[PDB]
A paper describes a structure:
To understand how these RuBisCO-specific chaperones function during cyanobacterial RbcL8RbcS8 (L8S8) holoenzyme formation, we solved a 3.3-Å cryo-electron microscopy structure of a 32-subunit RbcL8Raf18RbcX16 (L8F8X16) assembly intermediate from Anabaena sp. PCC 7120. In the L8F8X16 structure, eight RbcL subunits form a core of four antiparallel dimers, which resembles the RbcL8 octameric core seen previously in RuBisCO-chaperone intermediary structures. Similar to the L8F8 structure, each Raf1α domain of Raf1 is docked onto the interface cleft between two neighboring RbcL dimers, embracing the C-terminal TIM-barrel domain of an RbcL subunit. However, the Raf1β domain of Raf1, which binds to the equator of RbcL8 in the structure of L8F810, could not be modeled in the final map of L8F8X16 due to the untraceable density. Moreover, similar to the chimeric structure of L8X16 composed of Synechococcus sp. PCC 6301 RbcL and Anabaena sp. CA RbcX13, two RbcX dimers are docked to one RbcL dimer via interacting with the C-terminal peptide of one RbcL subunit and the N-terminal domain of the other subunit. Of note, Raf1α also interacts with one subunit of RbcX dimer (RbcX2) via several hydrogen bonds, including Raf1R140–RbcXK57, Raf1L142–RbcXR102, Raf1P143–RbcXR102 bonds, to further stabilize the complex. In sum, the ternary complex of L8F8X16 has three different interfaces, which possess a buried interface area of ~740, 1000, and 400 Å2 for RbcL–Raf1α, RbcL–RbcX2, and Raf1–RbcX2, respectively. In contrast to L8X16, each RbcX2 moves ~2.6 Å towards the equator of RbcL dimer in L8F8X16, forming an interface area of ~1000 Å2 between RbcL and RbcX2 in L8F8X16, compared to that of ~1400 Å2 in L8X16. Moreover, Raf1α in L8F8X16 moves ~3.0 Å away from the RbcL8 core compared to that in L8F8, resulting in a dramatic decrease of RbcL–Raf1α interface from ~1000 Å2 in L8F8 to ~740 Å2 in L8F8X16. As a consequence, L8F8X16 adopts a rather dynamic structure with a more relaxed RbcL8 core that comprises a 25 Å central pore in diameter, which is ~5 Å larger than those in either L8F8, L8X16 or L8S8 structures.
Residue numbers in the entry:
A (entry chain 4): 2 to 112
B (entry chain N): 122 to 195
C (entry chain F), D (entry chain E): 23 to 64, 80 to 175, 182 to 295, 307 to 329, 341 to 402, 415 to 471
E (entry chain 3): 2 to 102
F (entry chain C): 23 to 64, 80 to 159
The structure:
C-alpha cells in the first residue's frame, strides 16, 4: 500500500539526512582539527549503510563526535528537510516537461 | 526442562533479532528473558495477575537496571 | 443493557471472543458492543466485559464478549462459527466489523479430535525427518509424463492444482493411472517415496466417494482437496476418510481474520494448511501454550492442552533464490512449494547445515547459496535470474 | 496477447463471462483484461472479445471473456466457480474485480438436473395455490409449545433459524418430537397442512445423515438447511436426499454479484432461495428467456430451456403493515416471512382480491389495509404501530 | 550552505521516489504480462531509478511503460510530501533515544 | 522421593485422588504415600501433595495424589479404575487401603456422554 511505502521512505531519506550531517562535520573538521578529519575520513570509507545505525557504531569507539552528528538533526534538518514539499513537485512538473519533449523528438523523426 | 529452555532460546532469539537494545537491558540472556517477561507484563492493568510474570520476572533479571524495570510493576 | 457488565471476570470455562469494531458517526462505543453480544446469541447471554480502544487508527475499539460454555454443541465448528456471527455482520450502525480471535477453553478443546496426524505422526509414511518439504504444481498421457520428471529432481510431492477435473479431453480415471504409473517409476530410481497430490472434487459426494476410493485402493499416497467451495461440512465426509486410511491432509477492513479461520481448521483436521502476524498463527498451529501478545494479533491466552500440531505452507510465490529467508521464518516443521527441480533441493539442503554450525543464517543467507554453486550447475543458472536490486543512497 | 481477439464472435455454445474491472494507476484497460482471461484457464484458452466502458463511475470497464465448451466438466458448479475465478482475485494490478454474470449455453444447462421441484411441483404436497406463503422464526418442551401457537394464526410454516443445534440444555432429538407433536395438533384444528423448518447441521455428515433420516421417517414435511459454512459439495449429499424423499428445498466493490450466486444455486437445487436489480435475478429464477437489459445487471442472453423455476424469499425485515408493497414486486410465485400471527394472514389475503378487481394496488395500498380492519381486530392494532412519516414541504 | 543542500537533497529524493514507482511497476507485471517481467531487468542493472535514459533506448522498441512509471510517482509524491514533516521528525525521536541510552 | 512434593498446588485440570491409608508398625506416613502414587502410574508421574491425618481413629492418614490430565484415555472408566488401583492394593507394607474419592476435572467430565436420561429426560 502507501503506509508500507511512506514508512519505508521515512528511514531512507533520514539515513540520507544523517549523511549531510556527517559531511557538515567533515568540512568542519578539515579546518579546526585536521588530525580529526584524517581519522574521520579513515572510518568513512568502510561502506557502512543505515546512518541511524551507523552513528551507533561511532558511540562504540568515539561517544563524543556522534553527538555533533546528531546535533544537526535539530539544526540542519530544519533548513534542508522542511523545504522538501515545495521542491519535489516543482521538479516533477519539470520532468513532465523534460521527457514529454522526447515523445515529439521521435514523432519528428516519424515526420 | 526441555520446553522451558525451548522458549528461553526463543526469547533470546527475538531479543537478538532487534537492531536496538530496549531500555534498561544488556546483552546477557538473563536480561533477554526478563525483557520479554516485562514487555508482556505491561499490558495487564491488574495487580494480582501480573505477579505471575513478576516472580518469573524476578527470577532471571541480571543487571540492576533490569531489576528496577521489574520493580516498577509492583 | 444487561449485555454489558464490565464488573465481571470471564470464567475459566467461558468461550471468549474479540471484535475490531468501527461504528457510524455519533454511535457510542458502549452501545455498538451491546449491539454485538446480544444479537449473536438471542444466564444464557454473552456479555461484553471490556471496551479497550486502538491507538492511532480509525476509531476502532476492541470488544471482549464472553459466551457461556453450555451455549454450544460439543465438537462442532459450524455451530461456533454460525451462532456467533450469524446476523451480526448485517447491521448498518457499524462501518466495519472483524472477528480477530476466539478463546476456546481447555474443557471444550478436548471434546474435539483434531487433526488426524501431527508434527509427530506425519513422519511415519512420509520418509522426511527434521527438514521441510518440497512440491511443485503441474492431454492425459502427456500430463502423466510431466510429473514423471518433476519428482525426479527432489520434489517430495507435486500438486494437481489449478482445478483439473474430468473434462472431455482428459478424464478423471485416465489421469490417476498415469500419475500412479509415474510414481512407480520414480520411487526406486531416486531412493525416496513421493506422492502426487490429486483433486477429489466431484459434483455429488457419491461421485467424490469414487474419486477417493479409486485413488487409494492400496495404490497411492496421502492425497488432498480444499476448504473453499466446500465447507467444514463438505470436508467432514472425507477428512474422516483419514480415520480409516490416512490419506488427505493438505488443505489448499471487514472480514474474519485468518487466525480465527486457523483455529477452525486445526480442530476440524489436516496436517499442514495453506495460508509478527505472519509469525502469529504459525505459533498457533505448532505451539502448545501461547501467552498474550497484543502486538501480534494474539489477544487471548489458551493452552492447546495436548493436541496434534499442524505445519505451514509457503505462500509468497516462486522462491528459487530466496531460500534461506524461508528456512528461518517457518523453521523446521513446515512445507514449501528436472534441471529446474534439482536446483530446489540443493539450495534447501545446504543452508540447514550452515545453521547448525552456528553461522547467523539471517545476515549471511546469500553466501551460502553461492558456495553451493561450485558443486551444482543448476544453482549456477538461477542466482543470475533473480534480483540483486539495492540502494546505497546515504 | 492472443488472449484478446476482439475480431471474434463468441459462438452459440461458448461459456461466457463478464467482469467489472478496476485497475491500478497507469494500467491500461487492454492488458488487465488479458490478465484475467489468461490466468483463469492456464484452442483451449479464453479470449476477452470486448472491452466496453462504464459511464460516470470509477474507471470501470466491462470485460467479456469467452471460454470454450469442452473446458469444463458436465454437471458441476464447483468446477465452473473454481476454474474461472481461482487465482484471478489475487492480483495487485487491479484495485477491484467483480464477476457480474455468466452465460451458460443451452447445451450445458441441460446437462444439469436442476431444482428437484419447481413453480409447478411445489404445489403437490404444499396445499397453497396462486397466493404466496408465510412463515415466522422461533428449554425443549417450552420451545415446542411456542411453535404450537404460531402456526395457529395462518403461518404456512415456521423457521428453526438462528442456529439451534443440540446444546446441553436442548438436545437434537427432544426438539424434533415436540415440533412434530406440535404439527399433529394444528393440522386438523386449522384446516391446512403446515411444516416447521428444522436445521440438519451436524459436525460430520454421518451425524447429518441421522438428523435427516429421523426427521422424515414418514413423519414430517419438507425441511431444509443453508449454503454458507457448507458448500455446493456439502449440500449435494442432502439435496439429493430430495431425490428420494422430497424434503429439503428452502435455502437460507470487490465480490461476486448475487446473480452469479443464483445461477449456481438453481442449477444445484432448491425450490425457493433466500436473498431493477432486485427485480433482476427474480426474473432469472422464475423466467424461461431473458433478453439483454444492461440497466438491470442482465448483461447477457440465455434461455433457460425448460428447467424448473424457483421462487424468492422476502429479505427486508418485519413487514406487518407494509404488505401490499411486497405483493406487486415479488408477484404471486414467492414466499414471505397467535394474535400477532393472525394479523399476517389477513393483510395478505385481502390485497389479492383488490388486485383482481382492477384497482391499482400500487397507488392504493394503504386503504386496502384499512378496510380490512373492520372485520379483523388484529389489524386494528398493527397499523398504528407502523410509520406514517412524510414530508409536504413544497 | 543551508539552502543548496535543500536542492541537493531534492535531487536525491526524486530518485528514490522513482524507485517506489519501479518496485510497484515490477510487482504488478510479474503475473499479468510475464513476457514483460524478465526484460525489465535488462534496463535496471546497477541503477534502477532512471527516468528517461531507458526510454531513449525504449523509443526504438515500445516505450509505453515510462508514462506509467511517471503516473505511479504522482499518488505517492502527493501523499507523502505533504505528510513528510512529521514522518521524518517522528523517527528522529527514536534515534535520539536509542543513542542516548 | 520425587513422588512426594508438598510444595505444589494441584492444577485446574489435574486428576486427583484420595486414600484412607493404614500402614504396618514403624512404617512412616511419608513413605507409604510415596508407595502409592508411584506404583500406580509407573512430568508423567503422580505426586502425593498432602498428608493430612485422621483424628480419633486407627492411625489413618489422608493421602492426596495428583495425576496429570494426559495420563489417561478420554471417555473410559475401566482405564481410570485400573491405572490408578492396579497393583496398589497388593502391598504388605499396609494394613489396609481404601479409595475414598476422585476429582475429575471439568475438562475430563465433558469428554464422557453420561447417563442417557436424567432428572428431566425420565
Amino acid at each position: 500500500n502507501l503506509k508500507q511505502i511512506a514508512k519505508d521512505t521515512a528511514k531512507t531519506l533520514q539515513s540520507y539526512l544523517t549523511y549531510q550531517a556527517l559531511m557538515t562535520v567533515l568540512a568542519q573538521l578539515g579546518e579546526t582539527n585536521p588530525p580529526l578529519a584524517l581519522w574521520l575520513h579513515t572510518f568513512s570509507v568502510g561502506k557502512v549503510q543505515d546512518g541511524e545505525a551507523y552513528v551507533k557504531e561511532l558511540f562504540r569507539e568515539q561517544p563524543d563526535l556522534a553527538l555533533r552528528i546528531m546535533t544537526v538533526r535539530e539544526h540542519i534538518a530544519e533548513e534542508v528537510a522542511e523545504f522538501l514539499p515545495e521542491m519535489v513537485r516543482s521538479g516533477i512538473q519539470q520532468a513532465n516537461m523534460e521527457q514529454r519533449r522526447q515523445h515529439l523528438e521521435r514523432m519528428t523523426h516519424l515526420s | 526442562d526441555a520446553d522451558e529452555a525451548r522458549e528461553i532460546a526463543k526469547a533470546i532469539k527475538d531479543f537478538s533479532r532487534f537492531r536496538i537494545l530496549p531500555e534498561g537491558f544488556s546483552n546477557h540472556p538473563g536480561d533477554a528473558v526478563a525483557y520479554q517477561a516485562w514487555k508482556l507484563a505491561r499490558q495487564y492493568s491488574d495487580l494480582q495477575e501480573r505477579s505471575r510474570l513478576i516472580a518469573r520476572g524476578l527470577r532471571f533479571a541480571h543487571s540492576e537496571t533490569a531489576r528496577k524495570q521489574i520493580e516498577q510493576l509492583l | 443493557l444487561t449485555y454489558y457488565t464490565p464488573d465481571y471476570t470471564p470464567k475459566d470455562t467461558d468461550i471468549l471472543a474479540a471484535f475490531r469494531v468501527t461504528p457510524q458517526p455519533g454511535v457510542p462505543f458502549e452501545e455498538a458492543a451491546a449491539a454485538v453480544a446480544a444479537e449473536s446469541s438471542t444466564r444464557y447471554k454473552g456479555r461484553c466485559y471490556d471496551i479497550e480502544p486502538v491507538p492511532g487508527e480509525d476509531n476502532q475499539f476492541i470488544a471482549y464478549i464472553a459466551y457461556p460454555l453450555d451455549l454450544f454443541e460439543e465438537g462442532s465448528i459450524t455451530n461456533v462459527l454460525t451462532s456467533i456471527v450469524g446476523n451480526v455482520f448485517g447491521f448498518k450502525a457499524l462501518r466495519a466489523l472483524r472477528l480477530e480471535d476466539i478463546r476456546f477453553p481447555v474443557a471444550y478443546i478436548k471434546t474435539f479430535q483434531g487433526p488426524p496426524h501431527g508434527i509427530q505422526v506425519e513422519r511415519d509414511k512420509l520418509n522426511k525427518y527434521g527438514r521441510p518439504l518440497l512440491g511443485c504444481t503441474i492431454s492425459a498421457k502427456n500430463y502423466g509424463r510431466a510429473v514423471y520428471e518433476c519428482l525426479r529432481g527432489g520434489l517430495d510431492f507435486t500438486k494437481d492444482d489449478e482445478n483439473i477435473n474430468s473434462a472431455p479431453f482428459q478424464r478423471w480415471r485416465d489421469r490417476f493411472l498415469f500419475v500412479a504409473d509415474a510414481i512407480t517409476k520414480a520411487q526406486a530410481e531416486t531412493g525416496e517415496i513421493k506422492g502426487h497430490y490429486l483433486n477429489v472434487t466431484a459434483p455429488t459426494c457419491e461421485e467424490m466417494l469414487k474419486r477417493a476410493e479409486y485413488a487409494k485402493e492400496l495404490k497411492q499416497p496421502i492425497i488432498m482437496h480444499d476448504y473453499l467451495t466446500a465447507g467444514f461440512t463438505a470436508n467432514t465426509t472425507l477428512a474422516r476418510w483419514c480415520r480409516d486410511n490416512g490419506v488427505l491432509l493438505h488443505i489448499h477492513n471487514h472480514g474474519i481474520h485468518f487466525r480465527v479461520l486457523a483455529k477452525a481448521l486445526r480442530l476440524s483436521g489436516g496436517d499442514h494448511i495453506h495460508t509478527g502476524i505472519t509469525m502469529g498463527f504459525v505459533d498457533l498451529l505448532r505451539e502448545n501454550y501461547v501467552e498474550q501478545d497484543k502486538s501480534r494479533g494474539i489477544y487471548f491466552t489458551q493452552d492447546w492442552a495436548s493436541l496434534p500440531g499442524v505445519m505451514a505452507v509457503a505462500s509468497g510465490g516462486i522462491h528459487v533464490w530466496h531460500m534461506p529467508a524461508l528456512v528461518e521464518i517457518f523453521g523446521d516443521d513446515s512445507v514449501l512449494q528436472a534441471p529446474g527441480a534439482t536446483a530446489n533441493r540443493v539450495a534447501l539442503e545446504a543452508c540447514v547445515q550452515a545453521r547448525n554450525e552456528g553461522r547467523n543464517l539471517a545476515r549471511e543467507g546469500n553466501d551460502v547459496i553461492r558456495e553451493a554453486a561450485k558443486w551444482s550447475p543448476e544453482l549456477a543458472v538461477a542466482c543470475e535470474l533473480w534480483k540483486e536490486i539495492k540502494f546505497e543512497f546515504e
